[PDB]
Design an enzyme around this catalytic site. Structure first.
Site, PDB file in Angstrom:
ATOM      1  N   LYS A  15     -14.789  -9.231   5.292  1.00  0.00           N
ATOM      2  CA  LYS A  15     -14.710 -10.483   6.055  1.00  0.00           C
ATOM      3  C   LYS A  15     -15.596 -10.361   7.300  1.00  0.00           C
ATOM      4  CB  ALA A  83      -9.422   5.999   0.849  1.00  0.00           C
ATOM      5  CG  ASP A 126      -1.305  -8.921   1.809  1.00  0.00           C
ATOM      6  OD1 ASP A 126      -1.112  -9.693   0.847  1.00  0.00           O
ATOM      7  OD2 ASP A 126      -2.434  -8.696   2.292  1.00  0.00           O
ATOM      8  CG  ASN A 131      -4.231  -5.337   0.933  1.00  0.00           C
ATOM      9  OD1 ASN A 131      -5.407  -5.416   1.281  1.00  0.00           O
ATOM     10  ND2 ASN A 131      -3.374  -6.354   1.043  1.00  0.00           N
TER      11      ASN A 131
HETATM   12  N1  LIG Z   1      -9.805   3.317   4.917  1.00  0.00           N
HETATM   13  C1  LIG Z   1     -10.656   2.933   3.972  1.00  0.00           C
HETATM   14  N2  LIG Z   1     -11.037   3.852   3.043  1.00  0.00           N
HETATM   15  C2  LIG Z   1     -11.937   3.496   2.089  1.00  0.00           C
HETATM   16  N3  LIG Z   1     -12.724   2.430   2.083  1.00  0.00           N
HETATM   17  C3  LIG Z   1     -12.158   1.418   2.793  1.00  0.00           C
HETATM   18  C4  LIG Z   1     -11.204   1.583   3.816  1.00  0.00           C
HETATM   19  N4  LIG Z   1     -10.981   0.361   4.450  1.00  0.00           N
HETATM   20  C5  LIG Z   1     -11.874  -0.448   3.903  1.00  0.00           C
HETATM   21  N5  LIG Z   1     -12.634   0.140   2.895  1.00  0.00           N
HETATM   22  C6  LIG Z   1     -13.438  -0.677   1.968  1.00  0.00           C
HETATM   23  O1  LIG Z   1     -14.053  -1.748   2.666  1.00  0.00           O
HETATM   24  C7  LIG Z   1     -13.602  -3.040   2.153  1.00  0.00           C
HETATM   25  C8  LIG Z   1     -13.412  -3.962   3.353  1.00  0.00           C
HETATM   26  O2  LIG Z   1     -12.358  -3.477   4.246  1.00  0.00           O
HETATM   27  P1  LIG Z   1     -11.234  -4.551   4.569  1.00  0.00           P
HETATM   28  O3  LIG Z   1     -10.722  -5.130   3.342  1.00  0.00           O
HETATM   29  O4  LIG Z   1     -10.191  -3.969   5.427  1.00  0.00           O
HETATM   30  O5  LIG Z   1     -12.098  -5.623   5.374  1.00  0.00           O
HETATM   31  P2  LIG Z   1     -11.743  -7.016   5.957  1.00  0.00           P
HETATM   32  O6  LIG Z   1     -12.629  -8.049   5.406  1.00  0.00           O
HETATM   33  O7  LIG Z   1     -11.732  -6.839   7.403  1.00  0.00           O
HETATM   34  O8  LIG Z   1     -10.220  -7.226   5.463  1.00  0.00           O
HETATM   35  P3  LIG Z   1      -8.783  -7.695   6.148  1.00  0.00           P
HETATM   36  O9  LIG Z   1      -8.781  -9.178   6.230  1.00  0.00           O
HETATM   37  O10 LIG Z   1      -7.600  -7.129   5.393  1.00  0.00           O
HETATM   38  O11 LIG Z   1      -8.726  -7.158   7.481  1.00  0.00           O
HETATM   39  C9  LIG Z   1     -12.343  -2.676   1.373  1.00  0.00           C
HETATM   40  O12 LIG Z   1     -12.036  -3.599   0.400  1.00  0.00           O
HETATM   41  C10 LIG Z   1     -12.647  -1.254   0.856  1.00  0.00           C
HETATM   42  O13 LIG Z   1     -13.397  -1.174  -0.328  1.00  0.00           O
END
Ligand SMILES: Nc1ncnc2c1ncn2[C@@H]1O[C@H](COP(=O)(O)OP(=O)(O)OP(=O)(O)O)[C@@H](O)[C@H]1O
Length: 245
Positions: A15, A83, A126, A131
């Site tokens: 996002k 991860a 969620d 997640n």
């Molecule tokens: N701790 C982690 N370890 C591994 N890769 C991750 C991790 N956090 C995020 N990623 C990767 O990056 C992608 C984006 O992170 P995330 O989904 O948290 O972003 P976002 O758009 O900010 O989502 P949210 O709205 O839940 O905050 C994840 O779907 C995943 O593949």
């Protein structure tokens, strides 16, 4: 902490969240750095404080660690555990369907993590494939507690009836278990009004391969009334689980 305190690596996903692989320039510690843009955080705020506070404090091998966080002029940075194996969402797309042993195992690890969370009065709210992350040995790891407090197919009748606080993670669990073994959510539909109706009346069926033991556990977890769903302890001791995990 300062952005200068880390070496930035290749991108891990996205996002406003641009998550990058990083390494602390002091001990080569590899971790994931999630970047959040303030403009896009305000534009749509505390929903984030909610996270940081909750996750920072959790500590379970099956829960993604939030070692800390910091801010800049336009950039907020969450310092998370790295991860290696990505998300269970992608894994499921790759395997299309999980076997009973992998499923039981993931459910076990997830119930242990939730047990830990619930003992601290923290509810995820969620739980879904996107997640859930996998560590260096395939250890499931719960992440993104942005909805946690103190996805349409995975929401309980109590969140669509008219939002509640405690047996919603058991519902998500039973749903997840089904999607794991079948490859698709139990109430999946082409429409919102039908996945809503289907969830509202708990209308779902099992292919023919889903075994009796799994059918039993899933049926118990997907009860319309909350109180009627089992406790995490019951899940852990269910025959299908103990025999396949
Ligand atoms: N701790 C982690 N370890 C591994 N890769 C991750 C991790 N956090 C995020 N990623 C990767 O990056 C992608 C984006 O992170 P995330 O989904 O948290 O972003 P976002 O758009 O900010 O989502 P949210 O709205 O839940 O905050 C994840 O779907 C995943 O593949």
């Amino acid at each position: 902490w300062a952005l200068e305190d880390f070496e930035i690596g290749r991108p891990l996903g996205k996002k406003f969240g641009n998550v990058y692989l990083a390494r602390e320039k002091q001990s080569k510690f590899i971790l994931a750095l999630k970047v959040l843009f303030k403009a896009q955080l305000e534009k749509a705020e505390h929903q984030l404080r909610r996270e940081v506070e909750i996750q920072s404090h959790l500590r379970h091998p099956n829960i993604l660690r939030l070692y800390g966080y910091f801010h800049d002029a336009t950039r907020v940075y969450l310092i998370l555990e790295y991860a290696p194996l990505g998300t269970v969402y992608r894994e499921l797309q790759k395997l299309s369907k999980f076997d009973e042993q992998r499923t039981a195992t993931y459910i076990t690890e997830l119930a242990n993590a939730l047990s830990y969370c619930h003992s601290k009065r923290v509810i995820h709210r969620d739980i879904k494939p996107e997640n859930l992350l996998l560590g260096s040995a395939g250890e499931l790891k719960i992440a993104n507690f942005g909805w946690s407090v103190h996805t349409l197919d995975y929401l309980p009748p109590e969140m669509i009836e008219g939002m509640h606080d405690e047996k919603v993670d058991l519902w998500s669990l039973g749903v997840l278990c089904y999607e794991f073994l079948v490859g698709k959510p139990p109430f999946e539909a082409n429409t919102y009004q039908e996945t809503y109706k289907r969830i509202s009346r708990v209308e779902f069926t099992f292919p023919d391969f889903v075994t009796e033991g799994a059918r039993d556990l899933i049926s118990r977890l997907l009860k319309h009334n909350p109180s009627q769903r089992p406790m995490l302890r019951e899940v852990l001791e269910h025959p299908w689980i103990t025999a396949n995990s």
